Amino acid sequence: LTRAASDYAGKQAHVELAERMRKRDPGSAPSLGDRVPYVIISAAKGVAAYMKSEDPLFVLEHSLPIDTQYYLEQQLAKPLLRIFEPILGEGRAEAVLLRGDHTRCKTVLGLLAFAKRRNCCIGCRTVLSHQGAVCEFCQPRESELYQKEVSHLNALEERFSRLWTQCQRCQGSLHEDVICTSRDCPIFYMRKKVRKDLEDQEQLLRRFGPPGPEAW
Amino acid sequence: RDTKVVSMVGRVQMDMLQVLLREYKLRSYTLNAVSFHFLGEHSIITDLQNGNDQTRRRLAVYCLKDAYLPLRLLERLMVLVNAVEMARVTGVPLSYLLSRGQQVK
Amino acid sequence: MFEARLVQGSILKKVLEALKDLINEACWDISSSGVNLQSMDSSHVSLVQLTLRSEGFDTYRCDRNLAMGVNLTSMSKILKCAGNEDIITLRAEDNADTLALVFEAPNEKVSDYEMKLMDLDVEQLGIPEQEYSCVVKMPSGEFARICRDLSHIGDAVVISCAKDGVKFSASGELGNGNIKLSQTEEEAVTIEMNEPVQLTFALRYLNFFTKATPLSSTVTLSMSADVPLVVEYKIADMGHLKYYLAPKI
Amino acid sequence: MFEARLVQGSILKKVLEALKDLINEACWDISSSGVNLQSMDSSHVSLVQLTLRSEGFDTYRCDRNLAMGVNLTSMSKILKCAGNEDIITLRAEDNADTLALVFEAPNQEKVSDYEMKLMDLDVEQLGIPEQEYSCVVKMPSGEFARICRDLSHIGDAVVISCAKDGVKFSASGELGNGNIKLSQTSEEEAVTIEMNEPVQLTFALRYLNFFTKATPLSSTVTLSMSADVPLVVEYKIADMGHLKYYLAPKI
Amino acid sequence: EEAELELLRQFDLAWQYGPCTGITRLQRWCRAKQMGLEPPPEVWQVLKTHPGDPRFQCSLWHLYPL
DNA sequence: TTAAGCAATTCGTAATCATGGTCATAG
DNA sequence: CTATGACCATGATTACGAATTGC
Numbered sequence: 001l002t003r004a005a006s007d008y009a010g011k012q013a014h015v016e017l018a019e020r021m022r023k024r025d026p027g028s029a030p031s032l033g034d035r036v037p038y039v040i041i042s043a044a045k046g047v048a049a050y051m052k053s054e055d056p057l058f059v060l061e062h063s064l065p066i067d068t069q070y071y072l073e074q075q076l077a078k079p080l081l082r083i084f085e086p087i088l089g090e091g092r093a094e095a096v097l098l099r100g101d102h103t104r105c106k107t108v109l110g111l112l113a114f115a116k117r118r119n120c121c122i123g124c125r126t127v128l129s130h131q132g133a134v135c136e137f138c139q140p141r142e143s144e145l146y147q148k149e150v151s152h153l154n155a156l157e158e159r160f161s162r163l164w165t166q167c168q169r170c171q172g173s174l175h176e177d178v179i180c181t182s183r184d185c186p187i188f189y190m191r192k193k194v195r196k197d198l199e200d201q202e203q204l205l206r207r208f209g210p211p212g213p214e215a216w
Numbered sequence: 217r218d219t220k221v222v223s224m225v226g227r228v229q230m231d232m233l234q235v236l237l238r239e240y241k242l243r244s245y246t247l248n249a250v251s252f253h254f255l256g257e258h259s260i261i262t263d264l265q266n267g268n269d270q271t272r273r274r275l276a277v278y279c280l281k282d283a284y285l286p287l288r289l290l291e292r293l294m295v296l297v298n299a300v301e302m303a304r305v306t307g308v309p310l311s312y313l314l315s316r317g318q319q320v321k
Numbered sequence: 322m323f324e325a326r327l328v329q330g331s332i333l334k335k336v337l338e339a340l341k342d343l344i345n346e347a348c349w350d351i352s353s354s355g356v357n358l359q360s361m362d363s364s365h366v367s368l369v370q371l372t373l374r375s376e377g378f379d380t381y382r383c384d385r386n387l388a389m390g391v392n393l394t395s396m397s398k399i400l401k402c403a404g405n406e407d408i409i410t411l412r413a414e415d416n417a418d419t420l421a422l423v424f425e426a427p428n429e430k431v432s433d434y435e436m437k438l439m440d441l442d443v444e445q446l447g448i449p450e451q452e453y454s455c456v457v458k459m460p461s462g463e464f465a466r467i468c469r470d471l472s473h474i475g476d477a478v479v480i481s482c483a484k485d486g487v488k489f490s491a492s493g494e495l496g497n498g499n500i501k502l503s504q505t506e507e508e509a510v511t512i513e514m515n516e517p518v519q520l521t522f523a524l525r526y527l528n529f530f531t532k533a534t535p536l537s538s539t540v541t542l543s544m545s546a547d548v549p550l551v552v553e554y555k556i557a558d559m560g561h562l563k564y565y566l567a568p569k570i
Numbered sequence: 571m572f573e574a575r576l577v578q579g580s581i582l583k584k585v586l587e588a589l590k591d592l593i594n595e596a597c598w599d600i601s602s603s604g605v606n607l608q609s610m611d612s613s614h615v616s617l618v619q620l621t622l623r624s625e626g627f628d629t630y631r632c633d634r635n636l637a638m639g640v641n642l643t644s645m646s647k648i649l650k651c652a653g654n655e656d657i658i659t660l661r662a663e664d665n666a667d668t669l670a671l672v673f674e675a676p677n678q679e680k681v682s683d684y685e686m687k688l689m690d691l692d693v694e695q696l697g698i699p700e701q702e703y704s705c706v707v708k709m710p711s712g713e714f715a716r717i718c719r720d721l722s723h724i725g726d727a728v729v730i731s732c733a734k735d736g737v738k739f740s741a742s743g744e745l746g747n748g749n750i751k752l753s754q755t756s757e758e759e760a761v762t763i764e765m766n767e768p769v770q771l772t773f774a775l776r777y778l779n780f781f782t783k784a785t786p787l788s789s790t791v792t793l794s795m796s797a798d799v800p801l802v803v804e805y806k807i808a809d810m811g812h813l814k815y816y817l818a819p820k821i
Numbered sequence: 822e823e824a825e826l827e828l829l830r831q832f833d834l835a836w837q838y839g840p841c842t843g844i845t846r847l848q849r850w851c852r853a854k855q856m857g858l859e860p861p862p863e864v865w866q867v868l869k870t871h872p873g874d875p876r877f878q879c880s881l882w883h884l885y886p887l
Numbered sequence: 888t889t890a891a892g893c894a895a896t897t898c899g900t901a902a903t904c905a906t907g908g909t910c911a912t913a914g
Numbered sequence: 915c916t917a918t919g920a921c922c923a924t925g926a927t928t929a930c931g932a933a934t935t936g937c
């Protein structure tokens with residue numbers, strides 16, 4: 001954030017984030033000469049990339065989505081087309097845009113609150129009445145569909161434990177609570193999402209019954 | 217850059233933040249970020265102080281670690297030895313290497 | 322293997338022109354109870370729910386529960402290569418991702434198209450059944466003209482259901498206006514009321530909802546406290562078609 | 571307190587549909603003689619005089635010589651929201667600067683009640699001369715619109731020759747010269763060229779397309795001209811009064 | 822009230838009952854009672870004359886993304 | 888009262904132009 | 915009910931202004 005008049009002369013993203021104060025604190029904000037960090041969230045105002053910028057801690061505590069198409073075509077794509085072309089021809093632009101094309105077809109994500117009360121078939125994604133995990137046409141193949149995804153729960157369990165005990169060694173103590181919300185540590189907010197991945201993947205396997213009793 | 221100054225006659229001031237911001241071109245200039253880059257590492261505090269005395273002892277150990285880190289950075293980065301050699305080769309005082317540019321020399 | 326045959330292809334063309342503007346991709350849940358569909362719109366605001374029951378298909382055969390992924394634009398382009406009197410049969414394998422449509426003229430000319438499907442990773446949502454307290458049954462033409470006529474003034478509309486009738490009001494920079502309707506076969510406006518209602522909804526969604534007007538003569542509007550307004554149509558011994566829209570706060 | 575009714579009310583839709591493409595505003599002079607409108611054009615070539623007597627209405631209460639101003643095209647966009655069998659009612663308070671339109675239905679089940687706000691006006695106003703018009707022609711309006719539109723695809727401005735036996739509508743264009751001749755026909759489809767002395771004049775055919783926007787507005791169209799004067803086209807608004815469009819001639 | 826909100830804030834930071842910022846308040850009160858360290862019978866007698874309020878029956882930092 | 892200098896590649900952001908698509912009118 | 919014309923927007927390309935690095 002440099003001198004304020006050159007950034008008066010033309011609208012930028014970081015200047016817009018800095019000059020927009022917060023409701024919590026109009027006494028801690030970027031000044032002249034420092035660096036402003038931001039990420040770009042997804043919206044439908046395509047004329048302006050200065051209308052989609054947000055503080056990293058604010059998108060942390062308020063959980064706004066990310067514009068994967070912005071990061072795909074505006075951040076990544078053109079440096080790669082600088083580097084990868086001179087070794088080959090223009091079939092190399094088509095090779096990386098086709099290596100995108102085999103891999104672009106896999107995406108993951110008022111009225112939106114009135115959902116749930118049923119879940120889609122784990123095999124073929126068909127919404128249906130009742131809580132059972134398998135579909136009646138894909139009911140036979142179920143031992144393989146249980147086998148699949150318990151090796152995913154197994155790998156999320158292994159990632160929870162390596163992270164939440166690293167904070168205990170970076171903190172010093174093994175007997176008291178961790179309080180470190182250090183925004184420059186990758187440890188923070190990577191220890192926050194595995195709790196939710198595990199929360200979700202544990203509940204998907206309770207679609208299947210229990211492997212035994214527990215009150216004996 | 218726009219800074220305040222406070223007057224002390226006889227004594228010399230060396231904020232390590234200004235030395236980093238003048239010499240080095242980095243990505244973040246927080247104490248955590250430069251302590252990781254060189255070495256390798258408000259509302260909660262108000263209830264660690266309105267509590268008991270072992271909480272206040274924990275607060276004091278945290279504050280003493282904070283007050284110790286810039287000494288280690290000053291002696292490890294060879295700051296002061298290079299400032300003394302710069303003042304001996306150029307012939308300007310030791311307060312001008314934190315306030316001025318490359319014209320007075 | 323799936324194979325259906327239906328004599329009135331016009332019903333199929335009306336339902337496919339209900340949806341080709343609001344939706345771009347869908348998944349058909351083919352079952353042994355019929356052909357059922359749920360989807361959200363592209364704007365993530367409104368819900369569609371379409372049911373074609375199994376009986377009304379005059380030759381049905383479904384072996385196993387399927388799920389087909391259809392681009393609705395290409396299908397809407399295919400179903401306009403079929404005149405309004407033809408007899409439509411659908412042919413699908415249980416191992417394939419390509420659908421067959423055969424149109425049979427009622428006179429020397431038969432036509433057959435193959436369309437490539439797509440695999441999609443969508444999630445299916447639904448609705449719970451509660452009793453909406455304001456129940457309107459009104460002519461569809463009047464509702465289409467009322468929405469289209471209030472549309473030029475401003476973009477919101479307030480629905481005001483009172484005892485004898487309902488009253489729609491709308492404002493804008495060139496002024497405001499309302500339209501009344503009162504209790505008095507299908508040109509009547511039957512109004513059941515327990516608690517009065519007043520709510521606000523945007524007009525672009527309503528002018529999307531009134532695109533499927535040739536499917537029936539009357540339209541059913543259901544309201545309650547703070548729930549999404551329901552617009553409901555019935556298709557004769559085939560099933561129904563419902564849109565869902567949430568009120569403004 | 572102004573409060574007036576019109577049962578066969580499609581005529582108001584019909585006049586403002588032929589009003590809004592010409593001019594953007596109107597000076598509505600409500601007198602006890604009824605509803606009147608003298609207004610110039612925007613290009614300083616033409617003029618509209620609308621007269622609506624009270625005896626062409628149904629039910630009437632006029633207590634004020636109101637002199638208001640209407641932005642026409644927004645009023646036309648509001649008038650596009652009512653059918654033609656529907657009854658048109660106007661209400662006006664002499665202190666409340668708004669127009670309250672009430673559209674009744676012939677089956678009375680759909681009620682409309684619209685409101686358009688007012689804006690101030692200081693419009694210019696000139697008087698028409700009264701004189702002798704050397705050629706007055708009674709014509710079908712649809713045939714007249716058909717003929718001038720048939721001439722619109724040749725050129726831009728029309729030359730007219732008005733004489734005893736026939737009348738001569740000629741024009742040039744980028745494809746050459748053309749002209750159509752008419753004669754009297756020996757109640758709505760009857761024509762008559764009443765003539766004293768033959769003349770020749772120049773007029774703008776595009777303003778004839780603008781004037782034929784009132785094609786469904788009467789039984790017959792009247793075309794009144796003389797030497798070097800505004801052509802007055804007349805659409806006799808049946809049982810109501812009349813609309814007269816003046817066009818100052820060309821040189 | 823306003824004196825009952827400091828007794829609970831004092832029970833929450835005494836180190837002789839446990840390291841408690843992941844669980845509820847009454848669960849930690851019963852955990853110490855099982856082991857019988859010395860829970861006092863006043864941090865119980867305000868968790869009974871209230872319903873499920875989130876500013877009595879929750880730890881101090883039950884916000885705060887730690 | 889004090890300040891090291893300039894050349895830029897380069898990409899982003901904004902504005903303008905072109906092209907089609909949709910809606911409304913008129914025949 | 916279709917066909918034609920007008921309007922409106924939307925998308926793409928080109929030109930200019932700005933953080934960092936090469937000297």
Ligand code: SF4
Binds near residue numbers: 188
């Ligand atoms: S979050 Fe990162 S910086 Fe903070 S204690 Fe854990 S490992 Fe250390």
Ligand SMILES: [Zn+2]
Binds near residue numbers: 121122123125135
């Ligand atoms: Zn299945």
